Design a protein around this ligand. Structure first.
Ligand SMILES: C[C@H]1CO[C@H](c2ccccc2Cl)CN1
Length: 164
């Protein structure tokens, strides 16, 4: 069913996360973590304190799809187990902010062709697939986008609900 999913998404905030490569999304799906550059780190920490649920919707650049979505379970923190992210050639792990813990809500893909009817008022009413990494997605658009994903029957949202 979709009822527990709708409960988790009620009054949530939503952010578009754009990844350079599938390997980092796979790492995030396996380890339940994400890390971003400091400008987006500050935005996500502010959002985590502001709303009952903060949802990250992931898309790998050039894939034509979203790869799933997850809920922040923590603000960012430093000093944990290091994460072997794939970095751009000139970059170092020291440029990153902290690590956010995340709980996956759906690890299934959604092609952009299925979201063409959804536009984001916070990005000039452009199709929701369009946006820089960290772009906030307005509540109604974000809720409908998450509801378009195929159900992920491997995930039990009972555990997600207890952290709220
Ligand atoms: C999952 C993380 C992995 O590191 C990326 C990065 C690190 C340092 C400089 C530039 C970038 Cl894009 C961002 N996404």
């Amino acid at each position: 069913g979709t009822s527990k999913l709708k409960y988790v998404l009620q009054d949530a905030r939503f952010f578009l996360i754009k990844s350079n490569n599938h390997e980092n999304v796979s790492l995030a799906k396996a380890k339940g973590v994400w890390s971003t550059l400091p400008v987006n780190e500050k935005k996500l920490n502010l959002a985590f304190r502001s709303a009952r649920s903060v949802i990250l919707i992931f898309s790998v650049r050039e894939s034509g799809k979203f790869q799933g979505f997850a809920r922040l379970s923590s603000e960012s923190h430093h000093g944990g187990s290091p994460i072997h992210w794939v970095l751009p050639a000139g970059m170092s792990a020291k440029m990153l902010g902290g690590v956010f813990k995340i709980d996956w809500i759906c690890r299934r893909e959604l092609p952009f062709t299925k979201s063409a009817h959804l536009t984001n008022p916070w990005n000039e009413h452009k199709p929701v697939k369009i946006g820089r990494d960290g772009q906030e997605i307005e509540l109604e658009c974000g809720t409908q986008l998450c509801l378009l994903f195929p159900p992920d029957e491997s995930i039990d949202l009972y555990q997600v609900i207890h952290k709220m």
